[PDB]
Amino acid sequence: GSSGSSGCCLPPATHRPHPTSICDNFSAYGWCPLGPQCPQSHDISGPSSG
Numbered sequence: 906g907s908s909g910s911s912g913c914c915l916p917p918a919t920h921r922p923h924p925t926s927i928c929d930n931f932s933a934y935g936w937c938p939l940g941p942q943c944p945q946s947h948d949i950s951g952p953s954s955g
């Protein structure tokens with residue numbers, strides 16, 4: 906297929922900070938019974954099925 910722009914992502918100047926541990930509920934489900942207080946991080950990436 907067509908392809909031009911080589912992704913408008915930030916330079917390698919510095920690698921972004923990585924999480925310590927993602928939750929199990931908010932991870933996929935999206936919601937968590939602990940809310941923001943939850944000790945685990947809640948990062949919504951957006952996986953695919955299939």
Ligand SMILES: [Zn+2]
Pocket residue numbers: 928929930931937938939940943944945946947
């Ligand atoms: Zn959680």
